[PDB]
């Protein structure tokens, strides 16, 4: 049997804008449920991540005033993104098209769904949700630095879309704002949102001898496959968020001409010319 996914139960009675995918944030449908299982998972990684995540992390969730206790509303913690880095975050039913997402990005919007999973499923949910897309994804945002890379991330999805290279910065976003490690002189640091907002990957990730933890290389990155439903086999460690960002500094085009006739890694190899951490 076929039943609808947790995104269509969810938006069932809703919309969003045509051409933005946008919608206003339905504060009416966060159920008691909703704001209890927010505050159970708030909890959780505030407990985890110190000494795992990096500070700025940790500084972005107090600066914005992150509800620990409820769904936060996302006119208010805007209020604040604003003023911080002329950011905001704008409510998305779920998955988007990408020239949307990317064109969100380029002009300072950060997507986030909306809705949240149910409680049976606070250990793990597959689909991105409000918890993983607002915790994980949105505190790093009021870093100016960071700010910029996710800009000009966004600003490349036109180019990448005509060469037919979105996966080749698929790759780069998953890498880096989703599973990214940074070091530092006090150890190695956790900045992915997908780690984040994880129950246990945020262990392994530095705790683990299994994972590979390799240098940040932009073309290696992009020539790197990435699984989904697994605890990544190899981490890209970077120096500084400025190192995000001067790396979207050259023209992308010849990179990903380059890239299309070549054998991708495989998300568990290493590499020849990998600096392993
Ligand atoms: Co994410």
């Given at each position: 049997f076929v039943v609808p996914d947790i995104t269509t139960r969810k938006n069932v009675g809703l919309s969003h804008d045509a051409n933005d995918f946008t919608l206003p944030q339905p504060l009416d449908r966060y159920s008691a449920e909703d704001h209890a299982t927010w505050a159970t998972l708030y909890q959780r990684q505030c407990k985890l991540?110190?000494?795992?995540?990096?500070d700025e992390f940790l500084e972005g969730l107090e600066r914005l005033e992150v509800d620990a206790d409820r769904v936060p509303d996302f006119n208010k913690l805007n209020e604040k993104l604003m003023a911080a880095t002329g950011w905001k975050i704008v409510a998305v039913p779920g998955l988007i098209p990408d020239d949307v997402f990317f064109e969100h990005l380029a002009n300072r919007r950060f997507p986030v769904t909306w809705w949240l999973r149910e409680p049976h499923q606070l250990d793990y949910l597959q689909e991105p949700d409000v918890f993983h897309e607002?915790?994980?994804?949105?505190?790093?945002?009021?870093?100016p630095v960071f700010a910029d890379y996710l800009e000009a991330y966004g600003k490349g999805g036109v180019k990448a879309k005509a060469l037919g290279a979105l996966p080749m910065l698929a790759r780069l976003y998953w890498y880096t704002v989703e599973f990214g490690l940074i070091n530092t002189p006090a150890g190695m640091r956790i900045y992915g949102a997908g780690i984040l907002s994880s129950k246990s990957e945020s262990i392994y990730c530095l705790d683990s001898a299994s994972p590979n933890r390799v240098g940040f290389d932009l073309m290696r990155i992009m020539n790197t496959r990435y699984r989904i439903?697994?605890?990544?086999?190899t981490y890209f460690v970077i120096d500084s968020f400025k190192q995000l960002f001067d790396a979207?500094?050259?023209?992308?085009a010849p990179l990903y001409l380059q890239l299309a006739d070549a054998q991708p890694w495989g998300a568990g190899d290493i590499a020849p010319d990998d600096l392993v951490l």
């Open positions: 991540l110190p000494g795992r995540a990096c607002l915790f994980g994804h949105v505190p790093l945002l009021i870093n439903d697994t605890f990544q086999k979207t500094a050259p023209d992308f």
